[PDB]
């Protein structure tokens, strides 16, 4: 019931639909109006609500009063969520039945043994001149387009391309996605691309040993068909959400596999990156700290001189 | 003007009936030359007749 094929949705036995299809608060199409008139008058049994942590929002919790069901199972992966509405979920669905021991499934081989690491980068002296000058939101660009953070992503890509690892570079703040993925000539799922070239970039990444990295931007924050990465270089994601950095971890465990987290030190992003490991340390995950990499100053890393470092400050600060 | 457009379709039917006759050469027992030149004469039976259609 996802409004593209609609394989006779009225009169069936298993209906697989979405949120904001069942709780679409505006005027519906005519094909959707006949199915919602059918779905509102038939009692079900065992609704399955995937991604349970989005139910306590204002729109998605009106679903449970539109459709009548006896049993309501909720399957998720990360139960934590900001704004304190998971205690709200104990009566919308029911009590918490089972929680998987995350260190026990790792020790039995059902989940890849993840080596967490939080490599933090010093700030360039030309960039810290403007980071402490202003407070009004332009400094979010200044810590994600750090030239010394660029050298830690280009080195970590090269360190695993020489080991035939499959790299996913998760990076929000889409201006930093362009100026990272065209200075290394790598494909990127920008977010407003398409449905077509979203697929062909996603499948040459899996069954081809030539394309090795991919630069997603806030798309893989759900249960998508991301094709089994081996490392994950997360660069400057959303602010203080421990839901997201347990969904980026799920891309890795699907030391065998291990993911990174680039942090420009002595900024606001150090406070954020310890608020997002606040959930993963409650599953036994150990987050190392890498201060200096394994010989970063000896390969052909970009942003070497200062004249090529001064141009980036004239590009980032020019936005405003 | 049809003749020069029909003199080419024979000219690589002679060199595409060779590839099956050479494809049996790479295998085992070769094909008899009286049968491979049978349909080739039949394919040339129209091309030579149309050769006088615009001679």
């Amino acid at each position: 019931f996802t409004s593209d094929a609609k394989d006779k949705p009225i009169g069936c036995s298993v209906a697989i639909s979405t949120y904001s299809m069942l709780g679409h608060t505006t005027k519906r199409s005519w094909e959707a109006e006949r199915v919602m008139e059918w779905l509102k008058t038939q009692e079900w049994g065992l609704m399955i609500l995937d991604e349970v942590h989005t139910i306590p929002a204002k729109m998605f919790r009106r679903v449970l009063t539109i459709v009548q069901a006896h049993c309501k199972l909720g399957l998720t992966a990360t139960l934590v969520r900001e704004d304190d509405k998971i205690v709200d979920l104990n009566f919308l669905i029911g009590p918490k039945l089972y929680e998987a021991n995350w260190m026990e499934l790792q020790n039995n081989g059902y989940i890849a043994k993840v080596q967490c690491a939080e490599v933090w980068c010093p700030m360039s002296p030309e960039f810290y001149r403007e980071y402490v000058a202003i407070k009004t939101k332009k400094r979010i660009l200044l810590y994600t387009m750090n030239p010394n953070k660029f050298r830690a992503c280009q080195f970590l890509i090269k360190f695993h391309e020489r080991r035939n690892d499959k790299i996913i570079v998760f990076a929000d703040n889409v201006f930093a996605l362009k100026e990272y993925a065209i200075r290394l000539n790598k494909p990127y799922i920008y977010g407003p691309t398409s449905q077509g070239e979203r697929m062909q970039i996603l499948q040459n990444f899996k069954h081809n040993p030539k394309i090795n990295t991919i630069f997603i931007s806030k798309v893989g924050d759900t249960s998508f068909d991301l094709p089994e990465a081996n490392v994950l270089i997360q660069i400057s994601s959303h602010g203080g959400s421990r839901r997201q950095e347990a969904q980026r971890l799920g891309r890795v465990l699907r030391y065998n596999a291990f993911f990174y987290s680039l942090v420009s030190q002595d900024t606001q992003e150090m406070a954020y990156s310890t608020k997002r490991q606040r959930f993963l340390v409650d599953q036994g995950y150990s987050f190392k700290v890498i201060t200096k990499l394994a010989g970063m100053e000896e390969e052909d890393l970009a942003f070497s001189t200062k004249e090529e470092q001064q141009q980036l400050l004239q590009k980032v600060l020019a936005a405003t | 003007k049809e003749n020069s457009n029909a003199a080419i379709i024979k000219r690589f039917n002679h060199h595409s009936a060779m590839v099956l006759a050479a494809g049996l050469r790479k295998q085992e027992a070769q094909n008899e030359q009286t049968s491979e030149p049978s349909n080739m004469d039949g394919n040339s039976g129209d091309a030579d007749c149309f050769q006088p259609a615009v001679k």
Binding site: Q314, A318, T320 | -
Partner: protein
């Protein structure tokens, strides 16, 4: 069996193409109807594809040759009284149809002017970004 003249007849030009019991003696070529094509039933009376084949009773069409193609494809034709009976069934009254067309006919000229301000705000952003910085 007919309804306009009530005569008993086996078959006519109608009731095998549109299911309408009307004899072929008068046939009303410019009196009761015309033959409206499919593309005129979408932009004049404003019906989607969920109105000609899903609203009960579903009406059928007549395939014919394309006039300016002659080798390409089809040209569907609908009966004109079946369309204006469907437009009164889908859109309330007849005085709701044209009143809904006024807010729709301005949406294309709204697109004509809103294309001309994003062409201003993008080409001026390429030159203002070079003078705001220092």
């Amino acid at each position: 069996i007919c309804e306009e003249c009530g005569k008993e007849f086996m078959d006519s030009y109608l009731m095998n193409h549109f299911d309408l019991p009307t004899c072929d003696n008068c046939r009303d070529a410019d009196d009761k109807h015309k033959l409206i094509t499919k593309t005129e039933a979408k932009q004049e009376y404003l019906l989607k594809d969920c109105d000609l084949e899903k609203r009960e009773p579903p009406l059928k069409f007549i395939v014919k040759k394309n006039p300016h193609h002659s080798q390409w494809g089809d040209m569907k034709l609908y009966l004109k009284l079946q369309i204006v009976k469907r437009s009164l069934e889908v859109w309330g009254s007849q005085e709701a149809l044209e009143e809904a067309k006024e807010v729709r006919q301005e949406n294309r000229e709204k697109m004509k002017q809103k294309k001309f301000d994003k062409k201003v705000k993008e080409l001026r952003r390429a030159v203002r970004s070079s003078v705001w910085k220092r």
